Paper text:
The proximal domain specifically interacts with Clcs, whereas, the N-terminal domain (NTD) of Chc, which adopts a WD40 beta-propeller structure, is pivotal for interactions with various adaptor proteins (APs). To investigate the existence of binding sites present in Clathrin NTD, we crystallized the N-terminal domain of Chc with different peptides derived from adaptor proteins containing CBMs. All our structures show that each peptide binds to three different binding pockets (Clathrin, Arrestin and W-box).
Crystal structure of Chc-NTD (displayed as a grey cartoon) bound to CBMs from Ent1 (1.75 Å, red), Ent2 (1.74 Å, yellow), Ent5 (Ent5.1 LIDL motif, 2.01 Å, green), Apl2.1 (Apl2.1 LLDLF motif, 2.75 Å, blue) and Yap1801 (1.95 Å, grey). Zoom: individual Chc-NTD boxes with Ent2 CBM-containing peptide. For the Ent1 and Ent2 complexes, a water molecule bridges the interaction between the carbonyl oxygen at the motif’s +3 position and N64. Water-mediated interactions are also observed in the W-box between the NTD backbone (L24, D25 and V309) and the peptide at position +3, for both Ent1 and Ent2. Residue K284 within the W-box establishes salt bridges with the carboxy-terminal of Ent1, Ent2 and Yap1801. For the Chc-mScarlet/Ent2-mNeonGreen pair, mutation of the Arrestin box showed a significant decrease in FRET efficiency (9.02% for WT vs. 6.7% Arr), while the W and Cla mutants did not show significant changes. Ent2’s main target site appears to be the Arrestin box as shown in our FRET in vivo experiments. Mutation of the Clathrin box showed a reduction of almost seven-fold in the binding affinity to Ent1 (KDApp WT ≅ 138 µM vs. KDApp Cla ≅ 968 µM), while Ent2 exhibits a three-fold increase in its dissociation constant (KDApp Cla ≅ 509 µM). In the competitive landscape, Ent2 demonstrates reduced efficacy in counteracting Ent1’s occupancy, corroborating what was observed in the FRET experiments. Ent2 interactions are weaker, especially in the presence of Ent1 as a competitive binding partner.
Residue numbers in the entry:
A (entry chain F), B (entry chain D), C (entry chain E): 1 to 7
D (entry chain A): -2 to 46, 48 to 368
Amino acid sequence: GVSLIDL
Amino acid sequence: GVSLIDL
Amino acid sequence: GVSLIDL
Amino acid sequence: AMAMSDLPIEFTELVDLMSLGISPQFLDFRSTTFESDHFVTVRETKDGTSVAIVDLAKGNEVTRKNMGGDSAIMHPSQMVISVRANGTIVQIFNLETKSKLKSFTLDEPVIFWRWLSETTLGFVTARSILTSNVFDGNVNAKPQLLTLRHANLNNTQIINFVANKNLDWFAVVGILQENGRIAGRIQLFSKQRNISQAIDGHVAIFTNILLEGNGSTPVQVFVTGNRNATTGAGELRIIEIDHDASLPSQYQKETTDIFFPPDATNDFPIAVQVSEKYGIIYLLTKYGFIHLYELETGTNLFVNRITAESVFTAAPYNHENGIACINKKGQVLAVEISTSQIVPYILNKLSNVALALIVATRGGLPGADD
């Protein structure tokens, strides 16, 4: 899954 | 319920 | 030994 | 923009990772790891196959090694790398001796890890929280269970794991999408009672403070910051843990606002670090705002946007006296108090002699002899 913190 | 601390 | 890295 | 001579802080760039040839494709939380200002570890991949270890203490010297592992961190101070593969296989090596400190396979994949102390590495799986004394000499011992994860951390991205010096209090931080924003959830854990408490928060740290009356004995405080995903209100809290009844002076709980401008709707606290020596809290937001607070009183000293590129990780700087961070352009930026300017700043900009005295006396700083 995509890393939230990097959004 | 029991909490550790007042937060 | 097993190694996960090139030492 | 505010000139450096007017600030209560010293602002520096430690290294620019793109300057060193690092692709922006790897400038992200899972790839570019930062446990301390001693090292940055960049995981790169090419053609189905490395780590670039940047030694900030040796002129940004880069050591590149191929690895079968898929994730890596350096220790806070020593030339010791921790590598994992397929979430289950973990090995920790002293790169100087080429000696293996730890080698084990977990039953459940590691999804997050972070150094808790100079001796102890923290691990989080989908269901559990564990720690290893990496230097105890028991190479093949698995990490010891600390506790199960609290339900509040369900469906979160785990982004931090911190502990007190005594290694008997812990906090695990997770974030999740809520109301179009990023909410934070923290699991606080007392090892003495083996009990957890779930709180709202994006950042957490344990620290210590010497109060008048307590002699040379510090009291312990937990520092945490949150932005409410519903209201948008930010709040910093500082609260004592485990007050020693023999000590006459107690730390009164402090609560302070964390300011967010009207056009920073989706910003949130991304890091918190503390100078024990100076009693200064450094709080950083994702959008690059630095907030300084005085630890004894919780008083906000300073707010400034130090970078316009989003921050994705941070760690302690300069023997844990400041904060360092990495932005999306690979700038490793550092903030610490200016030992020569902070007291004059409080006296002249904040017009507060008592607060100036608190800071000067605790830190042994110039500016308030008069």
